[PDB]
Design a protein around this ligand. Structure first.
Ligand SMILES: O=C(O)C(=O)Cc1c[nH]c2ccccc12
Ligand SMILES: O=C(O)C(=O)Cc1c[nH]c2ccccc12
Ligand SMILES: [Mg+2]
Lengths: 204, 202
């Protein structure tokens, strides 16, 4: 029974993870009207208010209007740099003269819990844009594991000490209801996201 | 000099960071902020002076926005199935079409062929490219999102060649510093020179 739903997600989730999961679902159920888009948190919330999307994946809880925030799992953060010293990295050991300031508030807030970095020359509000600067040796960053895995060779990806994490949320309007097929997708999405993150977290 | 440049996702995957890198190695006297957004959002943030510059594939003259035509971006057909070689728009399997939503890319495609409603709609370039990589469907996309995400045998020229225009947007009532305008000139030159070289390869 053909159901129509729109999923919006953060850019770091749209690079590979969400397309992979949507693919696995699309193959075992083709009669669908599936719309996917990647947006920043603020846009995701407004498009949810305006019923332009039905589901949003963020790293921030929200309780405005009728939006229900469901905690799916915890996303590990990693230090990324074009340097060939391997092993974990303490946040206090990071060279602040090469720091690229992130734009993800949750990422920033989590980093600010352990260290506040001063104003710098490069500020990058989109994960894959920051990763390209790291790839070219321009600077270093702390990012989610997904944007690091997708864009960087493993020699550039380092665990942080102490471990750092941020929460992954599925946002959904309460009063806007979903079809039976759509709720099946939501369950599948949440289980897959939790299982993948369960593994990744154990690897770190 | 502090300025914020917004750009489309396909331009942020590698092109704009490369050019910003080459500029920021030769000029450290600057506070550069970079973000990737959809056209709609880029325009609003430009209206509200939240960003100073936007790279789009669409002219805009609403409000105070001035559009500068930089270059033409070649469009390509992407599909892991279709064997290597150029592809006519009429020969496209519309059963496996991934709709790019509603933007300038779609309008440009609609000028030559209208594709019916389909099961997969993907409003973000790199998300569509991942579906192509997994064999799920095919698309027409800009060369940058195809080069960055796909191996070359998945990237096909279109017949007849299709292109879409690249624009730098700027508010008219927005004065920018000397260093910032130097970056703008460098950015426009590099974007044209790179596109000139890509277009000759196609
Ligand atoms: O805006 C994006 O691309 C995001 O998904 C948030 C984000 C995740 N990791 C980052 C690293 C640097 C800047 C933004 C992000
Ligand atoms: O850069 C983006 O993500 C855009 O909005 C434009 C776009 C370029 N190539 C595409 C392929 C599928 C959907 C949108 C685009
Ligand atoms: Mg994006």
């Amino acid at each position: 029974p053909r159901a129509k739903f729109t999923l919006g997600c953060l850019p770091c989730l749209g690079l590979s993870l969400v397309p992979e999961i949507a693919t696995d679902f699309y193959q075992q159920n083709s009669n669908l009207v599936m719309t996917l888009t990647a947006e920043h948190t603020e846009t995701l919330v407004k498009k949810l208010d305006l019923r332009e999307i039905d589901l949003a994946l963020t790293m921030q809880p929200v309780q405005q209007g009728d939006i229900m925030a469901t905690l799916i799992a915890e996303v590990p953060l990693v230090y990324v740099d074009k340097d060939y010293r391997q092993g974990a990295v303490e946040i206090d050991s990071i060279d602040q003269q090469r720091w690229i300031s992130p734009g993800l508030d949750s990422l920033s807030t989590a980093i600010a819990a352990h260290r506040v970095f001063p104003a710098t020359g490069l500020n990058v509000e989109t994960c894959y844009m920051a990763m390209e600067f790291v790839k070219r040796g321009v600077g270093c960053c702390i990012t989610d594991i997904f944007s690091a895995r997708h864009s960087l060779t493993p020699e550039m990806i380092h665990q942080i000490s102490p471990p750092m994490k941020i929460d992954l949320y599925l946002l959904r309007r309460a009063d806007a209801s979903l079809s039976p097929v759509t709720q099946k997708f939501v369950d599948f999405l949440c289980k897959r996201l939790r299982n993948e993150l369960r593994e990744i977290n154990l690897e770190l």
